[PDB]
Design a binder for this molecule. Structure first.
Ligand SMILES: NS(=O)(=O)c1cccc(-c2nnn[nH]2)c1
Lengths: 271, 267
């Protein structure tokens, strides 16, 4: 029982069938975030989260030990919930911190981007695709210190990306498989690299590159790679910054820069 | 509970991915089952054992299913090293082996067995479960020594529940996600087409001399009905197969349509 081991406090937030509360561990006094994930009862139900999806997330969280990523401290389960005891991240969203400023220079921005890249480099080294990198999932540990530390959060749709042959072997031979299996192109780590390109674009310019009037229009823009570097937004942005973004916002995932290439890019190597 | 307190373990029946199957008997009823011992992956292990996620995925599917043409899960235990599934004992062997032993097999007899496969798949699809590994070796008989043997579909090791998807902002999502086309129930319908083609002819429609040829043949839907091998096969049967072996999953017969097709419905 979690309440026997942690003193539960205020609600901090809520997401997909989950409620996050602040807590404090009895005995140590250390503070954490307790994420209560509502379990799905019957497999036919669309409420809660299936046990297998909870496990997928927990298995990924268990592996993580990097300063730019949230960590898992403990786990409990009661009748209705799986309770993850996570690192407490209190500094808010990176972009909300940046909002307190009157302006932001390209060099100030790249300080933070390097941290995001370092976190993603760690994840990708373990074959973990986050799949929902966006500003809301880029938090700060503490926003009042001189050099705030980025924390990537929310592994709710993260997956480990198996080697390509691990898929094919499961069928024994291809004799009975359909064409959509033969031609199956799995989602991979490249998707996160795209997201990084979008994050960089907005971090530097304040503009969202693909946002349309409706979600459907945004999706059309993404699929067409319909963006530009208009001077109203990019007149104080370097050419190397634009090159970095261009090499990420590539439709073909196989032609996009990888995280290693991103870190070797001259724009990033310069600091 | 420990499994040994409830079941007498017997002889080894088979093996799976990090799994051993043993015959067993329930204490208190004397009824026989198959016990499948699946080795759990340790948190410090990379590749040994089966992941908890994959065990849970399959178990949650098995827990849901009850139908005469599908293997039944009777009990589950877990100890330090293994998850143990107590499954219905399916003893009659492969359908295709039983058929190969018949003096003669008529098209009408063939359709009656095919209809049982369709009944099982109709049930699975009604629960949004794609089997994804339908092939002769997963189509067994419960008991072969009866006048009309009952088909049992087995092996839910790669089966999945089937279901834009983005509840928050789409602004950061990659084009391959925006354009993602998940694998679906239609894949099982293709497999049924291939099974039917082999059932009637003994030939495989897409198999090539190498793996790449087989893959290429599937993708192009490059098959035909050889005059010799299909000389005793009705046009109505060929029509059934043609309406399943279709490249676009959206244009294949669904399970409901397959059961309504005159080849099945006429009998
Ligand atoms: N407290 S919160 O609203 O930012 C929130 C909501 C849902 C999930 C998380 C989370 N998941 N993994 N790490 N943090 C956080």
């Amino acid at each position: 029982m979690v309440e026997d081991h942690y003193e539960m406090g205020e609600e901090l937030g809520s997401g997909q069938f989950a409620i996050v509360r602040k807590c404090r561990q009895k005995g140590t006094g250390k503070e954490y975030a307790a994420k209560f994930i509502k379990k799905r009862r019957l497999s036919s139900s669309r409420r809660g989260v299936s046990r297998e999806e909870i496990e997928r997330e927990v298995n990924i969280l268990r592996e993580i030990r990097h300063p730019n990523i949230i960590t898992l401290h403990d786990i409990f389960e009661n009748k209705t919930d799986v309770v993850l005891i996570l690192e407490l991240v209190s500094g808010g969203e990176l972009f909300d911190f940046l909002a307190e400023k009157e302006s932001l220079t390209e060099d100030e921005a790249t300080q933070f981007l390097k941290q995001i890249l370092d976190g993603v480099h760690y994840l990708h080294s373990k074959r973990i695709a986050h799949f929902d990198l966006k500003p809301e999932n880029i938090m700060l540990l503490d926003k009042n210190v001189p050099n705030p530390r980025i924390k990537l959060i929310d592994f709710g749709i993260a997956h480990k990306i198996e080697a390509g042959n691990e898929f094919k072997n499961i069928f024994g031979t291809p004799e009975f498989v359909a064409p959509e299996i033969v031609n199956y192109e799995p989602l991979g780590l490249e998707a996160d690299m795209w997201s990084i390109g979008v994050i960089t674009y907005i971090l530097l310019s304040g503009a969202s590159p693909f946002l349309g009037e409706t979600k459907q229009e945004t999706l059309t823009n993404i699929s067409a790679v319909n963006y530009d570097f208009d001077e109203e937004y990019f007149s104080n942005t370097s050419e190397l910054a634009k090159d970095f973004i261009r090499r990420l916002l590539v439709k073909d995932p196989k032609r996009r820069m990888t995280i290693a290439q991103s870190l070797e890019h001259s724009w990033i190597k310069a600091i």
